[PDB]
Design a protein around this ligand. Structure first.
Ligand SMILES: Nc1ncccc1Cl
Ligand SMILES: Nc1ncccc1Cl
Length: 165
């Protein structure tokens, strides 16, 4: 009944930076929220721990979740390699939005991005399923290690992750 909360503990070239937590909108997008929640706990035997934010573009987004190819070409969901676009109820309203990366319709895997700007042109194309709850400052810090082309100047990792409450 209560939306779950997950955390990532972010490191920058292995140095602790801080914690970002997310509310997952399981009330709106249960299937997509469950995927992210289980990948954050690692309870299916794989997931986000130790993965990186391989693409960070300041004033746009931080993308991560590619734990199989580490570069934006990989990842898998808890349902199989890909799963459908659950719905597009929630929109890309501003910084902090948590949304699924994809390579076309119905190609959700594990990769996700945290918005650092409003990205309304993604509405109805990427599934929005959560939002930063605490540590938007940490995301802003992360974002400073990006670049226009998305390459990061330091390795931004999810040193630890899991479920809170
Ligand atoms: N292509 C697919 N096949 C089976 C289940 C879900 C998807 Cl997206
Ligand atoms: N395999 C992928 N999964 C999610 C986003 C983008 C790609 Cl190429």
């Amino acid at each position: 009944m209560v939306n779950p909360t997950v955390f990532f503990d972010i490191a920058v070239d292995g140095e602790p930076l801080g914690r970002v937590s997310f509310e997952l909108f399981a009330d709106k997008v249960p299937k997509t929220a469950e995927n992210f929640r289980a990948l954050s706990t690692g309870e299916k035997g794989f997931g986000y721990k130790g993965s990186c934010f391989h693409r960070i573009i300041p004033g746009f987004m931080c993308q991560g979740g590619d734990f199989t190819r580490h570069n934006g070409t990989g990842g898998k969901s808890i349902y199989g390699e890909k799963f459908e676009d659950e719905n597009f109820i929630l929109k890309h309203t501003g910084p902090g939005i948590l949304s699924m990366a994809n390579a076309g319709p119905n190609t959700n895997g594990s990769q996700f991005f945290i918005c650092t700007a409003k990205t309304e042109w993604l509405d109805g194309k990427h599934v929005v399923f959560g939002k930063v709850k605490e540590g938007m400052n940490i995301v802003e810090a992360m974002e400073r290690f990006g670049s226009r082309n998305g390459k990061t100047s330091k390795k931004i990792t999810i040193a630890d992750c899991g479920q809170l409450e």
